[PDB]
Design a protein around this ligand. Structure first.
Ligand SMILES: *[C@@H]1O[C@H](CO)[C@@H](O)[C@H](O)[C@H]1NC(C)=O
Length: 153
């Protein structure tokens, strides 16, 4: 049913949000293409129906885990510790989502997702990874609006 919005309830948005707030300035300060958004799809209302939101959520989690987190090399240990915490949260969110799931990807959801990979691939890889990292607020806002998520805020 609409329950697909309950697959991340065990995730604590506040936890991720806080870890991110800690490095948000330092990471966003390195965004070399501010006039553009890698998560452009998440600034539109193209993905709002339950089934599409579930598909895009799992695609975005994989986008971060398999692409962003692999591509960003972080020499600052304090920043890396925060990003590890976020990464750990995302791994949990993927675990939770597995447990849940329907969640199939209709062609519109799939395309919405490819747009992001396509924007990402427009940039040099390290700039793409740090910029994506900087857009975590766009990702958290979208997750927040489309899922019953818990907050210890
Ligand atoms: C991004 O910035 C450029 C710079 O002039 C401007 O055309 C507009 O604000 C944006 N352009 C696009 C479509 O990326």
């Amino acid at each position: 049913n609409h329950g697909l919005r309950r697959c991340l309830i065990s995730t604590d948005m506040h936890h991720i949000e806080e870890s991110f707030q800690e490095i948000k300035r330092a990471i966003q300060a390195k965004d070399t293409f501010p006039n553009v958004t890698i998560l452009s799809t998440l600034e539109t209302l193209q993905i709002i129906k339950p089934l599409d939101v579930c598909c895009v959520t799992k695609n975005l989690l994989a986008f971060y885990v398999d692409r962003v987190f692999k591509d960003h090399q972080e020499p600052n240990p304090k920043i890396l510790r925060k990003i590890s915490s976020i990464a750990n949260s995302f791994l949990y969110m993927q675990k939770t989502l597995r447990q849940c799931q329907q969640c199939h990807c209709r062609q519109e959801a799939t395309n919405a997702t490819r747009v992001i990979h396509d924007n990402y691939d427009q940039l040099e890889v390290h700039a793409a990874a740090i910029k994506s990292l900087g857009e975590l607020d766009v990702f958290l806002a979208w997750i927040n609006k489309n899922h019953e998520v818990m907050s210890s805020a």
